[PDB]
């Protein structure tokens, strides 16, 4: 299928004492594979998936150097953003950066992205074409003009369409046994007698990967949205994901209702029915 | 694999 590599950076200023917190995590699809945390002891990019441990010392040295360099750019950003917004040095603020690339089921480049936020709001992002910037406000516009002058977009576009894609493919090959494995949901339905006259049917999807899934209820073959609840997809903690969807039904009428499960690991959608 | 240190500050 389609695949992605993404990095997520979070930098939070510590006005009380010392340097900002900086945490970087890297993902291939829904699998975290590296982390760097400024507060940790190693001061190294660390592995978080077994297949990345295939890489040797030059890789780890190189990733550590780059991620520490990015962390210093973010440290300078916090200061600069405080000035832009005329903010006091007393308060903590947050910067986030997310970037990466998608390839299609043929592993060709599809799309790249680089976005940057300040205090939880859009600040500046590359547009879909990777050739220009969107700036949310006049502070971000100042940045935009700076980065236009530096011709940042051109170097970033080269990374996203080039390096990012090549290394994604490398990882997908090296981690093939899990990264290219689809884990269809293990599904079952439970039944919770809610009162004398109503029952709740809960359709579970467990231990799936990747995280994308659709759970839908129908009654008599049509979509049921009334009296349903659908929880946010959540990590199991072993690398797989969980979700459920529930509907409240009149007791005795459970058979009209069907839960429909769509997932990349399923040859065709599953249908579950309480009988 | 990270991009090199070409991100400028804002």
């Amino acid at each position: 299928g389609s695949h992605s590599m993404r990095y997520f950076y979070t930098s939070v200023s510590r006005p009380g004492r010392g340097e900002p917190r900086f945490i970087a995590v890297g993902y291939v699809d829904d699998t975290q594979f590296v982390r760097f945390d400024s507060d940790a002891a190693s001061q190294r990019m660390e592995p978080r998936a077994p297949w990345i441990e295939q890489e040797g010392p030059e890789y780890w040295d190189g990733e550590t150097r780059k991620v520490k360099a990015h962390s210093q750019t973010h440290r300078v950003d916090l200061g600069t953003l405080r000035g832009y917004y005329n903010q006091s040095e007393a308060g903590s603020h947050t910067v986030q950066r997310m970037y990466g690339c998608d390839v299609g089921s043929d592993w060709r480049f599809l799309r790249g992205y680089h976005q940057y936020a300040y205090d939880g709001k859009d600040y500046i992002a590359l547009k879909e074409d990777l050739r220009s910037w969107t700036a949310a406000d006049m502070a971000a516009q100042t940045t935009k003009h700076k980065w236009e002058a530096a011709h940042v977009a051109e170097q970033l576009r080269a990374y996203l369409e080039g390096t990012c894609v090549e290394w994604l493919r490398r990882y997908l090959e090296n981690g093939k046994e899990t990264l290219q494995r689809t884990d269809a949901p293990k599904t079952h339905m439970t039944h919770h007698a809610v009162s004398d006259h109503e029952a709740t049917l809960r359709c579970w999807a467990l231990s799936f990967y990747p995280a994308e899934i659709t759970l839908t209820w129908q009654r008599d073959g049509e979509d049921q949205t009334q009296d349903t609840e659908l929880v946010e997809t959540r990590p199991a903690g072993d690398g797989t994901f969980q979700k459920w969807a529930a509907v409240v039904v009149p007791s005795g009428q459970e058979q009209r209702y069907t839960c429909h499960v769509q997932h990349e690991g399923l040859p065709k959608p599953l249908t579950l029915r309480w009988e | 694999f990270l991009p090199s240190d070409f991100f400028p500050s804002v």
């Binding site: 979070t10 945490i23 903590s92 986030q96 205090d119 939880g120 709001k121 919770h192 959540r234 903690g237 | -």
Partner: protein
Amino acid sequence: MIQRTPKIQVYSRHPAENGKSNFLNCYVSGFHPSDIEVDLLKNGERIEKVEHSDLSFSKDWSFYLLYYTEFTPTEKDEYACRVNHVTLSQPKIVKWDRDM
């Protein structure tokens, strides 16, 4: 800044069976800023050896973390996740329900 209050789910890794070792999760998501306190409770008391995932965030910039520990469910013992965040005036406690 944004302030967005956390969403909390408390659940087990595996279908819970009394007497069988398992993992108790508290997934906190949709929050901003990232500073957050999360404890897992057994019978109202803080469980000491609790780990958590590396801080990350969704497309909409809101953060998410998983806090987890090994546990063995029991008919009697109550488990819960307790969360504090700037958005909350007091800690929010959500009880573990094995059916959710």
